[PDB]
Amino acid sequence: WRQQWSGPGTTKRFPETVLARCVKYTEIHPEMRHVDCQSVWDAFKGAFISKHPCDITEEDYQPLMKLGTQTVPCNKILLWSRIKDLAHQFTQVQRDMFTLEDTLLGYLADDLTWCGEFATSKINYQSCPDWRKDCSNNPVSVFWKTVSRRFAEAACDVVHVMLDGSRSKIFDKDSTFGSVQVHNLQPEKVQTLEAWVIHGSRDLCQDPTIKELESIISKRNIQFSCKNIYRPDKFLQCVKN
Numbered sequence: 001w002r003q004q005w006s007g008p009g010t011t012k013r014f015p016e017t018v019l020a021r022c023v024k025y026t027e028i029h030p031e032m033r034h035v036d037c038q039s040v041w042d043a044f045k046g047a048f049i050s051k052h053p054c055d056i057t058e059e060d061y062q063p064l065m066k067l068g069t070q071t072v073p074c075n076k077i078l079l080w081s082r083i084k085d086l087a088h089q090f091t092q093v094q095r096d097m098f099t100l101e102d103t104l105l106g107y108l109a110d111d112l113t114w115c116g117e118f119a120t121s122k123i124n125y126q127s128c129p130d131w132r133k134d135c136s137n138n139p140v141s142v143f144w145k146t147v148s149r150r151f152a153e154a155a156c157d158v159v160h161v162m163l164d165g166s167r168s169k170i171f172d173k174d175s176t177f178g179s180v181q182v183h184n185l186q187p188e189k190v191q192t193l194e195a196w197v198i199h200g201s202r203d204l205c206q207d208p209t210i211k212e213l214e215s216i217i218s219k220r221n222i223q224f225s226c227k228n229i230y231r232p233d234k235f236l237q238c239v240k241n
């Protein structure tokens with residue numbers, strides 16, 4: 001008897017990857033160079049090993065959050081929903097802008113999966129809990145919830161958010177962005193949230209779910225703005241001009 005979750009297990013070579021990522025990020029971001037990447041890995045590991053993979057708390061990720069403190073310029077923030085690919089292409093071109101995944105902690109975990117088990121220091125490479133079918137307080141989900149919150153709370157001025165214009169729900173209130181990030185934007189620092197609806201033929205800023213988004217934001221005393229992005233590759237090459 002070995003317990004089986006419904007989600008894929010920890011990515012192969014996850015320890016070696018996270019550590020390699022930390023080392024590489026520090027090499028290219030000179031302002032992080034003093035960071036001890038072996039301590040960063042140990043803290044990451046410390047959050048979830050020896051714990052039941054359903055009994056994880058934000059507080060578990062505190063030692064890692066502290067070591068990975070990085071308050072990027074808050075007026076340069078890009079949020080996204082169900083359109084991670086393009087959001088990242090954008091910040092590769094508009095290199096001063098930052099997504100969560102361009103921050104050290106987000107850079108480390110992007111596209112990865114991980115979990116441990118109760119009482120032992122073993123990483124589970126065969127299965128990890130699905131957030132839907134098994135339990136929502138797993139290592140991955142709790143990680144992303146914690147860093148998202150700090151990231152969205154730090155934001156200031158005009159905050160931008162990309163949305164996928166092809167989806168049935170362009171703004172999906174049951175998602176990290178619509179349920180976590182949007183409710184963490186601070187009225188003191190944030191003047192405006194500007195949505196960028198990415199087309200994949202007509203004004204999608206009229207959409208019912210965008211109006212929902214506007215309603216949410218309006219109730220936080222934050223101004224709202226929406227812009228259609230008809231030609232994706234054309235927008236990429238028109239940001240700097």
Ligand SMILES: *[C@H]1O[C@H](COP(=O)(O)OP(=O)(O)OC[C@H]2O[C@@H](n3cnc4c(N)ncnc43)[C@H](OP(=O)(O)O)[C@@H]2O)[C@@H](O)[C@H]1O
Pocket residue numbers: 078079080081082083099100131132141148174175176177178181
């Ligand atoms: C901070 O977060 C957003 C990016 O997050 P977003 O793309 O809005 O997240 P999605 O809901 O589109 O997908 C995230 C993955 O996690 C699963 N999931 C976990 N918990 C979930 C809840 N409570 N609702 C919905 N989805 C949840 C998703 O699995 P399914 O979509 O259910 O298969 C999905 O794999 C950015 O702005 C960044 O800055």
Ligand SMILES: Cc1cc(NCc2c(C)cccc2C)c2cccc(C(N)=O)c2n1
Pocket residue numbers: 101109110111112140141142144145148174175176177179180
């Ligand atoms: C696997 C995963 C899950 C994410 N969010 C899950 C979630 C949701 C959807 C709602 C409420 C709470 C949580 C924790 C997630 C969010 C942002 C980014 C990434 C990324 N970059 O891989 C990312 N990944």
